[PDB]
Tab-separated table of C-alpha atoms in Angstrom:
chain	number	residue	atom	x	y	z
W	1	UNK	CA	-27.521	25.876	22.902
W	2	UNK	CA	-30.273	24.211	20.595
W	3	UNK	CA	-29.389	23.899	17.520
W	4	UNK	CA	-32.624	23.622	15.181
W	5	UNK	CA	-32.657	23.161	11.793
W	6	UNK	CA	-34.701	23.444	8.573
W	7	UNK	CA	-35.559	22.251	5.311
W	8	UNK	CA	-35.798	25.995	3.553
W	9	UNK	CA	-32.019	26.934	5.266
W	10	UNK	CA	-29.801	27.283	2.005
W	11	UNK	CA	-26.416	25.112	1.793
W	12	UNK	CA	-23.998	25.819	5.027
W	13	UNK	CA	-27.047	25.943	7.423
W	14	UNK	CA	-28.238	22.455	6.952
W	15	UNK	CA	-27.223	19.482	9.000
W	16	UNK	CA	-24.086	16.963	8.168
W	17	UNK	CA	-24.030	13.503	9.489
W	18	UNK	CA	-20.116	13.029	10.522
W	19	UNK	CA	-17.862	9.674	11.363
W	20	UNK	CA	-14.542	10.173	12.065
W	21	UNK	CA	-12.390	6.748	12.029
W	22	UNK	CA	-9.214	6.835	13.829
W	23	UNK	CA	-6.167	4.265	13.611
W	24	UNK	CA	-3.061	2.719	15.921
W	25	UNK	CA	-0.440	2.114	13.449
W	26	UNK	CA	2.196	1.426	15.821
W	27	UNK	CA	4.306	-2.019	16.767
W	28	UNK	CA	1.772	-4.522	18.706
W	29	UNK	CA	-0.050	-7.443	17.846
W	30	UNK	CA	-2.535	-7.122	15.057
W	31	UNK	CA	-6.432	-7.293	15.709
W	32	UNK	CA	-7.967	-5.761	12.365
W	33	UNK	CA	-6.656	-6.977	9.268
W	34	UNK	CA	-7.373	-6.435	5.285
W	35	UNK	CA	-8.900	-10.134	3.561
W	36	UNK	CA	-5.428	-11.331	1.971
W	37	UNK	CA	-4.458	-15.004	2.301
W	38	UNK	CA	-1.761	-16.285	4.436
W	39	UNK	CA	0.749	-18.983	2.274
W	40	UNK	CA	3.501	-21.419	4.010
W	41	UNK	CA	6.731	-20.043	5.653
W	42	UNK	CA	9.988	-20.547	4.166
W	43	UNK	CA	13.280	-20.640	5.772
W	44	UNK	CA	17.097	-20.743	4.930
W	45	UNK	CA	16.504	-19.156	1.176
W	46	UNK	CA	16.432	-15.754	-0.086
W	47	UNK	CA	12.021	-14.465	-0.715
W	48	UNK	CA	9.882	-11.684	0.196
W	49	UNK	CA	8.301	-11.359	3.356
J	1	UNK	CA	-9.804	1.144	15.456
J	2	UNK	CA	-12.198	3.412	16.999
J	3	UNK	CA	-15.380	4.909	14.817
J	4	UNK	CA	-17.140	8.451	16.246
J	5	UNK	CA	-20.317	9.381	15.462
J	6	UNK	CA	-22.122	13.341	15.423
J	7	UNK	CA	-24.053	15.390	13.688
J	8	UNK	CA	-23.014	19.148	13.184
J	9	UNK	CA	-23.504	21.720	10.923
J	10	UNK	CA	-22.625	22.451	7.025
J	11	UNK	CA	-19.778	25.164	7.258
J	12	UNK	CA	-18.316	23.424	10.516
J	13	UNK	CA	-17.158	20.539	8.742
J	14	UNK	CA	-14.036	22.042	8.024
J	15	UNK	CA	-13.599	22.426	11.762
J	16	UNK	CA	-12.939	18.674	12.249
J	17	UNK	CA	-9.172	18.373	11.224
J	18	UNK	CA	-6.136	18.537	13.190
J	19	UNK	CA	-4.811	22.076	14.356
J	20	UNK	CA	-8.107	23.863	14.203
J	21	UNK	CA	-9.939	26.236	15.927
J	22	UNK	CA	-13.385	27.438	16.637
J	23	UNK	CA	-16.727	26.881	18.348
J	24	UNK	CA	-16.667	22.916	17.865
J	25	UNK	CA	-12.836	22.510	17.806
J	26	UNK	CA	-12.647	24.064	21.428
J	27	UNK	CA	-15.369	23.301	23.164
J	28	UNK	CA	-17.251	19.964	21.542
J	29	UNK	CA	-14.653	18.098	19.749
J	30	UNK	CA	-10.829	18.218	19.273
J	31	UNK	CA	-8.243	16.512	17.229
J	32	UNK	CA	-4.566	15.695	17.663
J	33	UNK	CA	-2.095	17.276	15.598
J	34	UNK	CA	-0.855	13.788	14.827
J	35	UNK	CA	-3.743	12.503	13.972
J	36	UNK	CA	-3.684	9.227	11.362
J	37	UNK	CA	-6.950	8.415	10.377
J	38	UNK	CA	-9.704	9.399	8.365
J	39	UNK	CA	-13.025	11.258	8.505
J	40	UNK	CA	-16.527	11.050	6.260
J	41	UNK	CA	-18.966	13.535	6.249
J	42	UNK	CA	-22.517	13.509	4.282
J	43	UNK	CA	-25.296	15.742	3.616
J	44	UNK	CA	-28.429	14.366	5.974
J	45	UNK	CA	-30.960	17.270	4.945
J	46	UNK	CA	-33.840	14.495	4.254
J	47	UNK	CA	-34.064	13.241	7.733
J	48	UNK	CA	-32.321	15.822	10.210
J	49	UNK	CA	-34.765	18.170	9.815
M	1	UNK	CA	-28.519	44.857	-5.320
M	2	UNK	CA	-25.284	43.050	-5.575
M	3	UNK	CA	-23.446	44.827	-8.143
M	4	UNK	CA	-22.323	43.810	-11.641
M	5	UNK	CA	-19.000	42.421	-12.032
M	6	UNK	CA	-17.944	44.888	-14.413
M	7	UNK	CA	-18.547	47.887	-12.009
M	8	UNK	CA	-18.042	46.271	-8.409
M	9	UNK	CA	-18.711	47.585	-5.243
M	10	UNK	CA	-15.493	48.587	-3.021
M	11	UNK	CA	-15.901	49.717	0.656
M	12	UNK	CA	-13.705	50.615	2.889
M	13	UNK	CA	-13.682	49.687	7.271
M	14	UNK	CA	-12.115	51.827	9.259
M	15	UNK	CA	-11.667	52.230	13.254
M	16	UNK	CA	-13.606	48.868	14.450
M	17	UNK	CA	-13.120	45.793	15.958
M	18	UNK	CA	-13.561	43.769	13.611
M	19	UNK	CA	-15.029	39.931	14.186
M	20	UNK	CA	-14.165	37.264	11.541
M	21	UNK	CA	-16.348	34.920	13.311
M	22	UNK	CA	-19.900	36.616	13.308
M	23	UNK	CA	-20.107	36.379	9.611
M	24	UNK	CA	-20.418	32.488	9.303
M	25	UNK	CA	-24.253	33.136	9.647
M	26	UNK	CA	-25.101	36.038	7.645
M	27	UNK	CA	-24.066	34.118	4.501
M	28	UNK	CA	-24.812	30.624	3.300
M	29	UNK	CA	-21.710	29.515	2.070
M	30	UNK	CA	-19.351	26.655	3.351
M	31	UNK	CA	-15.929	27.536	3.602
M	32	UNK	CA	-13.540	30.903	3.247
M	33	UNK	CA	-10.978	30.546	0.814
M	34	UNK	CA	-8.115	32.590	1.892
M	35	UNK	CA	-4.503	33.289	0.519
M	36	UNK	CA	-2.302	35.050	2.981
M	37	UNK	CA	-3.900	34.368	6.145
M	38	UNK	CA	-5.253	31.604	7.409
M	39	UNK	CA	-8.996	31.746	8.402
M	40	UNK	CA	-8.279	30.393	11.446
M	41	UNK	CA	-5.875	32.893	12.887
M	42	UNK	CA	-7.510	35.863	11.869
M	43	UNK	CA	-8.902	37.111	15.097
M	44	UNK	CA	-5.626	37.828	16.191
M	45	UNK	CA	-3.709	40.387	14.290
M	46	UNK	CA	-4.045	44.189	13.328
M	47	UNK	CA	-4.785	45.220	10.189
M	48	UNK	CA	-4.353	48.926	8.733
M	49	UNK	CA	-7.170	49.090	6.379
């Protein structure tokens, strides 16, 4: 079905421009990551990870 | 990540969310119930029409 | 001739089947509000008055 629109149609009957963004947070390697810097690795003493 | 792109209608927006139902949730476009992710919709009256 | 507020209008429906889905476009507005029901499942129940 068409599906025409116009500028006099009141709020509801005017046209929406969607995007829809969908995620995989599961366990696999990364591909997309947030900008925070990467420091040294430490091993054999207690730190957050 | 995946990004999805339409254009529909003012009071169908509230169509595009998991565990819907409706004219665009049946037949056009359908969500998981799990769904993680988010969506952005925007008024586009200027140029759709 | 919408009413005023401080004498509204009341009518009552009576034997019909009734269509909660015809009524997005005889109104402009964008969503239903709703309390007991949801919107969604409304064209499946029975309703005394």
């Amino acid at each position: 079905q068409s599906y025409g629109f116009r500028p006099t149609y009141g709020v509801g009957h005017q046209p929406y421009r969607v995007v829809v963004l969908s995620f995989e947070l599961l366990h696999a390697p990364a591909t997309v990551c947030g900008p925070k810097k990467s420091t040294n690795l430490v091993k054999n003493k207690c730190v957050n990870f | 990540v995946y990004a999805d792109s339409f254009v529909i209608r003012g009071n169908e927006v509230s169509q595009i969310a998991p565990g819907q139902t409706g004219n665009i949730a049946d037949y056009n476009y359908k969500l998981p119930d799990d769904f993680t992710g988010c969506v952005i919709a925007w008024n586009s009256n200027k140029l759709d029409s | 001739r919408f009413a005023s507020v401080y004498a509204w209008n009341r009518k009552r429906i009576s034997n019909c089947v009734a269509d909660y889905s015809v009524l997005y476009n005889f109104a402009p507005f964008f969503a239903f509000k709703c309390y007991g029901v949801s919107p969604t499942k409304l064209n499946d129940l029975c309703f005394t008055n």
